[PDB]
């Protein structure tokens, strides 16, 4: 149907905007602390602590399969990255501090992304 195509084009365009958002958020992590999944070889107890691990590579795989239907879904995964790190790691660590800075800087980006998603529809 033509309706299904139109919906698919809307999803494609959301995926474009989310790719640009993802790039901008990841630039706020110049240490690359959040680039890849926490290694279960190197942190063997991780899943005892964190039930839904997340990282930028995993988000990018989902994105490229057009697996985010709306910005809320994408924000949920971003927040997991931050929130997981702020639980596993203590306040005095480079990891926790990196997460706080990512959260604070990403807020700016996400605020305008929400306006753009609503605005363009």
Curated annotation (Swiss-Prot):
Q: Which domain of life is it from?
A: Eukaryota
Could you tell me in which tissues this protein is expressed? Highly expressed in testis.
Q: Which residues form the Bromo domain?
A: 9-113
Glycyl lysine isopeptide (Lys-Gly) (interchain with G-Cter in SUMO2) cross-link position in this chain? Answer: 41
* Localisation: Nucleus; Chromosome
Q: What does this protein do?
A: Scaffold subunit of various histone acetyltransferase (HAT) complexes, such as the MOZ/MORF and HBO1 complexes, that acts as a regulator of hematopoiesis. Plays a key role in HBO1 complex by directing KAT7/HBO1 specificity towards histone H3 'Lys-14' acetylation (H3K14ac), thereby promoting erythroid differentiation.
Q: How does it assemble?
A: Component of some HBO1 complex composed of KAT7/HBO1, MEAF6, ING4 and BRD1/BRPF2. Component of the MOZ/MORF complex composed at least of ING5, KAT6A, KAT6B, MEAF6 and one of BRPF1, BRD1/BRPF2 and BRPF3. Interacts (via PHD-type zinc finger domain) with unmodified histone H3. Interacts (via PWWP domain) with dimethylated and trimethylated 'Lys-79' on histone H3.
- Put simply, this protein is called Bromodomain-containing protein 1
- Write down the species: Homo sapiens
